[PDB]
Coordinates of C-alpha atoms and ligand atoms in Angstrom, one line a residue:
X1307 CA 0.0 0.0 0.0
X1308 CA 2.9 2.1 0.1
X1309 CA 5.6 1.2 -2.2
X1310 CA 6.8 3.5 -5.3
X1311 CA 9.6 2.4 -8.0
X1312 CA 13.7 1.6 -7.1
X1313 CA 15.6 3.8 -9.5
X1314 CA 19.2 5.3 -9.2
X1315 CA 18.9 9.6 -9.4
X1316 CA 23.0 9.4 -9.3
X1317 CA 26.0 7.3 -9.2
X1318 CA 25.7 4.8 -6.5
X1319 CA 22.4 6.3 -5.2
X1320 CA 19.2 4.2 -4.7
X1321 CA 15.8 5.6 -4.1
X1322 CA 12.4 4.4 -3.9
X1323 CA 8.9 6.5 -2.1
X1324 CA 7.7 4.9 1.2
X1325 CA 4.3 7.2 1.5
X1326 CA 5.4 10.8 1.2
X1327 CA 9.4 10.0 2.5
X1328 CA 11.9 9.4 -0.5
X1329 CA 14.4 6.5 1.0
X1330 CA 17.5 6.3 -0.4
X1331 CA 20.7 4.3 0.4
X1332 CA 24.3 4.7 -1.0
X1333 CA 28.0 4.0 0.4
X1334 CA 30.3 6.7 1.7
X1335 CA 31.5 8.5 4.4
X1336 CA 28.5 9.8 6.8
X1337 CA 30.7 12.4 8.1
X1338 CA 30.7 14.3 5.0
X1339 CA 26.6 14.5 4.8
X1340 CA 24.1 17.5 5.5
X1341 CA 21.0 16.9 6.9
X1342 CA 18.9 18.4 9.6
X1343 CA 19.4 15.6 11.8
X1344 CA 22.9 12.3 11.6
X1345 CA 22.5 9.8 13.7
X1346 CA 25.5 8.1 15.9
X1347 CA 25.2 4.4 16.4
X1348 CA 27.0 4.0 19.6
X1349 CA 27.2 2.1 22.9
X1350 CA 25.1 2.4 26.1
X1351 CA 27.4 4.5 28.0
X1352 CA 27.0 6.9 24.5
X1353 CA 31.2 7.3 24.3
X1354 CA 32.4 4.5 21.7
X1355 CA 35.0 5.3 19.5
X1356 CA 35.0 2.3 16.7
X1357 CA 33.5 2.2 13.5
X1358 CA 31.6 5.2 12.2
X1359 CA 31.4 6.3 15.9
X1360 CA 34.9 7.1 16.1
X1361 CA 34.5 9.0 12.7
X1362 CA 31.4 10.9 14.1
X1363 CA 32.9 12.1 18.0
X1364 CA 36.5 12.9 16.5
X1365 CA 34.2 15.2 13.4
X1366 CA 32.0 16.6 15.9
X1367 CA 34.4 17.7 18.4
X1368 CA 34.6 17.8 21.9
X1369 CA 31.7 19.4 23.2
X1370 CA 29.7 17.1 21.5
X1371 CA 31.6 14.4 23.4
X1372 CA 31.2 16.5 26.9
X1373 CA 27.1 16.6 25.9
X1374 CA 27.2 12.8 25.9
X1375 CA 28.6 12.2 28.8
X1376 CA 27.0 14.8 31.2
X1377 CA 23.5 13.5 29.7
X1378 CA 24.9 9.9 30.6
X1379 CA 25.1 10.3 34.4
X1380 CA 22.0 12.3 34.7
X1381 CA 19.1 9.5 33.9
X1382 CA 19.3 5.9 32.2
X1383 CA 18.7 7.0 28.2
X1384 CA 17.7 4.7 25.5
X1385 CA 18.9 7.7 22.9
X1386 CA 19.8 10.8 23.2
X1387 CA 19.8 14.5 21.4
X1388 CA 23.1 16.6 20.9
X1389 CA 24.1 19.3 19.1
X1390 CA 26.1 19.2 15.5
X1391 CA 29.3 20.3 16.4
X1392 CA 31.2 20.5 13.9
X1393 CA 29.1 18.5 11.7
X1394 CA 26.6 19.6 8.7
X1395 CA 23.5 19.0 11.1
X1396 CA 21.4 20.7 13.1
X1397 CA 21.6 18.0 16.0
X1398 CA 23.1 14.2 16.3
X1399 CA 20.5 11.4 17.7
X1400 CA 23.1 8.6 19.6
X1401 CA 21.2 5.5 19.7
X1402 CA 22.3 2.2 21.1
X1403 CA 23.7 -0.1 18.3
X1404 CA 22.6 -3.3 20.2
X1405 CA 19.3 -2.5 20.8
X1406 CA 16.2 -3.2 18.7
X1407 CA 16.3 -1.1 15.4
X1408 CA 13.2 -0.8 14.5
X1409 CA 12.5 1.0 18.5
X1410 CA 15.2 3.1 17.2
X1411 CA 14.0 4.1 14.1
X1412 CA 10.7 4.9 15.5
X1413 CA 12.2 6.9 18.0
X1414 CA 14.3 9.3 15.6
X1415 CA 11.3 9.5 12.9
X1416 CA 9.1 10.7 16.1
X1417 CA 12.2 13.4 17.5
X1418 CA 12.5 15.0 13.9
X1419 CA 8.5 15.8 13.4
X1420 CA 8.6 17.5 17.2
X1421 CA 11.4 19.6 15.9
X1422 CA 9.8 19.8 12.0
X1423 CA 12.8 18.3 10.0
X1424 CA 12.8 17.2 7.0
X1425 CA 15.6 15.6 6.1
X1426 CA 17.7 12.6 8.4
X1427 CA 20.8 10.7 7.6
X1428 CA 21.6 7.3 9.6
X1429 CA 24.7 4.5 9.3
X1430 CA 23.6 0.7 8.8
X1431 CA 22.7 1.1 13.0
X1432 CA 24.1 -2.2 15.1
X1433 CA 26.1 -3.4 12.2
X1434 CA 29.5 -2.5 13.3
X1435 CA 30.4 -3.1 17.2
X1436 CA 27.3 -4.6 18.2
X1437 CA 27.5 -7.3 15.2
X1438 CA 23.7 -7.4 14.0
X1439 CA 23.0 -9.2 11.2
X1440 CA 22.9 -6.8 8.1
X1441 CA 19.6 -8.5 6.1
X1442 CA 17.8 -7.7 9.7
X1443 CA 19.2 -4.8 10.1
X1444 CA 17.9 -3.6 6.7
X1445 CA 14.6 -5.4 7.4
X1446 CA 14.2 -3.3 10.5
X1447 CA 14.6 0.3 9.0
X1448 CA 12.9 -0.4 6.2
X1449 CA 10.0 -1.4 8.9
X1450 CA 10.1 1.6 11.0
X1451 CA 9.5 3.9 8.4
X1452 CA 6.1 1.9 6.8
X1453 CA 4.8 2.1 10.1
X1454 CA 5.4 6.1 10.8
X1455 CA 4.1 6.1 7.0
X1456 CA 0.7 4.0 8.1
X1457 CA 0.0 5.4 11.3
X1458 CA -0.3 9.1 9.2
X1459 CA 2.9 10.6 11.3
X1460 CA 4.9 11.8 8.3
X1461 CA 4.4 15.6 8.2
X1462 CA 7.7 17.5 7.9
X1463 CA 9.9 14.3 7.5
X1464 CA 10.2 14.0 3.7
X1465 CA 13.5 12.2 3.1
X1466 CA 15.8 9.8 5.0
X1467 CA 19.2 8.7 3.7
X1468 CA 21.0 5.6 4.9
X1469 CA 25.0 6.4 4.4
X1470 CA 26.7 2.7 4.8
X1471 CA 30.9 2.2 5.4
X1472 CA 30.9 -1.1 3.8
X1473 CA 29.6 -1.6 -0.3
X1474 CA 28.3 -5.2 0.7
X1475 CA 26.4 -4.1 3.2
X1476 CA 25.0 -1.4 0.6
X1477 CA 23.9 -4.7 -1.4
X1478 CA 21.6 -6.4 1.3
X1479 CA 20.0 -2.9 1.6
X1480 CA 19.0 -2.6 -2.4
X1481 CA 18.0 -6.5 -2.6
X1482 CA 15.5 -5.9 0.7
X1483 CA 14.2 -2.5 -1.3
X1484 CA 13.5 -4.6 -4.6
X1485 CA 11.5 -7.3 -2.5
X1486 CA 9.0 -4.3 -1.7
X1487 CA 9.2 -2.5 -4.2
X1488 CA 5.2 -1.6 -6.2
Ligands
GUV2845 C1 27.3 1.3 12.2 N1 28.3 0.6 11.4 C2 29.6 0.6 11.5 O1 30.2 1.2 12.5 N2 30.3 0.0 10.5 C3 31.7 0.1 10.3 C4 32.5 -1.0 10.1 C5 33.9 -0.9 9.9 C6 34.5 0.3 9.9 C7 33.7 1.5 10.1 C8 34.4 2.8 10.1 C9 33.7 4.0 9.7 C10 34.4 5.2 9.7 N3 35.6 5.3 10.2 C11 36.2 4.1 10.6 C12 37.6 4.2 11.1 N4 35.6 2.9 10.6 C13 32.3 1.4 10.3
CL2846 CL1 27.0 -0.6 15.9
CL2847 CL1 27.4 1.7 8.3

């Protein structure tokens, strides 16, 4: 009920409609990317430096780092909301690579419509440190975002990008889109 069309709009870019969000995936360097909101896929103590999280805190700089950890002994977070730093965003959302993606998902669509984004950029989320599978991974994003979709919640969000290290992991993403797509 949802489902437009995978075509490429440039070089190694894929993009199909979900509702009114265009979903598109491609391999690179998520540091590099604008958007109003990046997410971090991190640890539960939000300070890991491996993988794309180690490219993310050392971009961002150190007050982004010092906003993590004062929010970290203040309450137990499942996520949490930081400025930019010196990245092209208006804020990063650090989520917990090992827990449930979809719940993650959810959570940043939901964040960005109380702030009126329009535009998000995530990693492959818990394929790196926390060793989830990619196919579920992609199974799980692709999820969250039918559901915001079907529930009528997509208002300002129009467009969410999924920047992945690693071209095979790129791969599982396209073959999950082409099993949807109308
Ligand atoms: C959430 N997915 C990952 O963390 N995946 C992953 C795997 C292997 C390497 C990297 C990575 C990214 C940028 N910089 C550096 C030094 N390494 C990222
Ligand atoms: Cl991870
Ligand atoms: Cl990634």
């Amino acid at each position: 009920m949802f489902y437009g069309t995978v075509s490429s709009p440039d070089s190694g870019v894929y993009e199909m409609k979900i509702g009114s969000i265009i979903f598109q995936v491609a391999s690179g360097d998520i540091t590099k990317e604008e958007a109003d909101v990046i997410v971090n896929s991190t640890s539960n103590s939000f300070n890991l430096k491996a993988g794309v999280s180690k490219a993310i805190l050392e971009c961002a700089g150190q007050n982004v780092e010092r906003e993590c950890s004062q929010q970290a002994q203040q309450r137990k977070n499942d996520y949490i909301i930081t400025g930019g730093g010196f990245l092209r965003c208006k804020n990063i959302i650090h989520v917990i690579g090992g827990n449930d993606v979809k719940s993650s998902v959810s959570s940043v669509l939901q964040e960005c419509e109380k702030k009126n984004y329009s535009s998000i950029c995530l990693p492959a989320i818990g394929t790196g440190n926390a060793k989830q599978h990619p196919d579920k991974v992609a199974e799980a994003i692709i999820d969250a975002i039918e559901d915001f979709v079907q529930k009528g919640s997509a208002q300002s969000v129009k467009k969410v990008k999924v920047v992945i290290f690693l071209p095979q992991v790129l791969d599982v993403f396209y073959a999950n889109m082409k099993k949807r797509e109308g």
